[PDB]
């Protein structure tokens, strides 16, 4: 039994996983919404607030002129939210096939980038979580039925939420416990709290009002101590000495610290005008030394929300170092003692001059400070937590862009004028003990297949017989005829190897048809290093040595950087040196930065269905296709394998009951079928044109060729519009006629007659009809001189107002004195 559910978990066949496989919503969306009760049942007012709240957040980084009218921008934000939340479409799809519904009608107004679209997904979830918490609290109070003026005012006017809940928890503890302070409140001693002359609530409204609308009422005949003693004497039985006074003052403090109006005031000021200081421990005092990367924050003081908006990494440094108990990041307000005194003046302070008024003002003043100490301690932690998260988000963005630049590398092409995926000969000289360490070379063909490897034993720099190596290389290059050569290695001997290889190429005149020496490039080997020592490489090539697995990986990286990253395991991909700060992210944030980047580029590049069904390397991209995740990618390949025949058209995904409406809409344009029974093959299945735009596509072809409306209406009635694609395909004048459609006018007329906004759609329709699935990644990046160096080598503010010079000096003097003491110890 227990072993049955292990194999289910392994195969992704648990009940929970079967629901995910079956449900017609993108897998990632199902994962994201898993913790959200009633995801689809938000009120109208809430949906409205979510659009404005989100719209504002994205608006930030756009830097829109103060004059700028934000109305069309907010409508784009609304549209994206419709697509994500109501139509369950993913970012790649929205960006590919709805760009004009998230862009400004007017040229270069605004565009919601893919970055924006991912933020909107994340913020959407997060807004639904709030609404969840808000509905939980508001349903918890409406359930109580009690009519507390504070909370009723609250849900009308509206971390305030947590405070409201706590105020109900504190005040009505007994009344809800059906559905310590509470028992003191029943005690006779609580009379003394009444005698203080102003309720916690009144203080709260004083502070909210900014003036003392509720003046305290001093006890007429008695001081605090007397009132207490009168209450003790009149209750010999129950109560059993200044401790009593302390208690009254403690529980009154407590009532003050639970007031939402007081906590709200402090929260807003503290969160706007905080400063961060570093407080060291001995461990941090000696460890930095000037060598660690903290030479500009070892005595960091008075850091502002602006300082951390600009350099958000800085704080995370602080939080990790504190989790190392090397230091502790302290947040505080500019003039905290004075900020509190001021609030006391406005809220509690009396100018009555009698002894009785004096002792009561002192008593209230103490209770108020005790309460403000608690509030500040809480708010200090909230602002810290939210600053951490806020900085983790800024870093997540850059980690995602860095990883995307790695992924956004087109297959290396040796001759840009005649783009052809090259036959590859990749080499490594390993340790580089020339004449002792064999040189390893591998030959991988255009389709990505490994053909064979070589083991050159001729010493490249043989003094007596140099020509031996030259000739062997010539032989290999005549047998394989590569179009490009890729290399890399552990040390600078790899460089000498490269220089040499250039000489041998020119001497033997190994060239292109164009007479240019075949290009040699250094190849990023961060994947190759992890592959050569992997179970899957040992499994894929059971009886080859490390450096052969390493060279196969070099070639494969040249062919598709994307597929190389996409074929690492979670463990292997997370261990890459992607960004120096990536370890400051939570595993969940890191996973999201990587996954969104995968999804962006995997859908840009697409996946040929047939080639994935029976090739696991290539099928590794499937899980990142719009609509798919890890469970749907499997279920889908299994559906295809059961089919025992190749897929002939996109539409078969639905006729065969492989995909339903939604996952089909999400994915169909990113899943293609290569073009070259007869009536069963659609040519548009080899383009980035989506099935829903097929009718538009054939119309573009018909107009390109200048066909009559009688002829078009005729085919339109017949149901043979598809015939126009072949007609454009036969026609030899097709490129010039396509290129001559004025696409702006065409989108104008189209919208005018149908209301559809399809300009961007029409653009990639004409480009895809010219040449299906042209390559759209940015260029392959051969390692440049600097990176070569680092690869083979390993080598790569003290202003008194923001820097604690005094502490630095005193710590330096105590350290020196420390060294003197350590010396003496002999």
Swiss-Prot record:
Keyword Transcription among record annotations: yes
Keyword Transmembrane helix among UniProt keywords: no
Protein name per UniProt: Transcription elongation factor SPT6
Family stated for the protein in its record: Belongs to the SPT6 family.
Swiss-Prot/TrEMBL GO biological process terms: cellular response to stress; chromatin remodeling; G1/S transition of mitotic cell cycle; negative regulation of transcription by RNA polymerase II; nucleosome assembly; nucleosome organization; poly(A)+ mRNA export from nucleus; positive regulation of transcription elongation by RNA polymerase II
Principal location class: nucleus
Gene Ontology molecular function: DNA binding; histone binding; nucleosome binding; transcription antitermination factor activity, DNA binding
Extra remark: Present with 8890 molecules/cell in log phase SD medium.
Keywords, in A-Z order: Chromosome, Nucleus, Phosphoprotein, SH2 domain, Transcription
UniProt superkingdom: Eukaryota
GO cellular component assignments: euchromatin; mitochondrion; nucleus; transcription elongation factor complex
Compartments in which it is found: Nucleus; Chromosome
Function of the protein: Histone H3-H4 chaperone that plays a role in maintenance of chromatin structure during RNA polymerase II transcription elongation thereby repressing transcription initiation from cryptic promoters. Mediates the reassembly of nucleosomes onto the promoters of at least a selected set of genes during repression; the nucleosome reassembly is essential for transcriptional repression. Essential for viability.
Assembly with partners or alone: Interacts with CTR9.
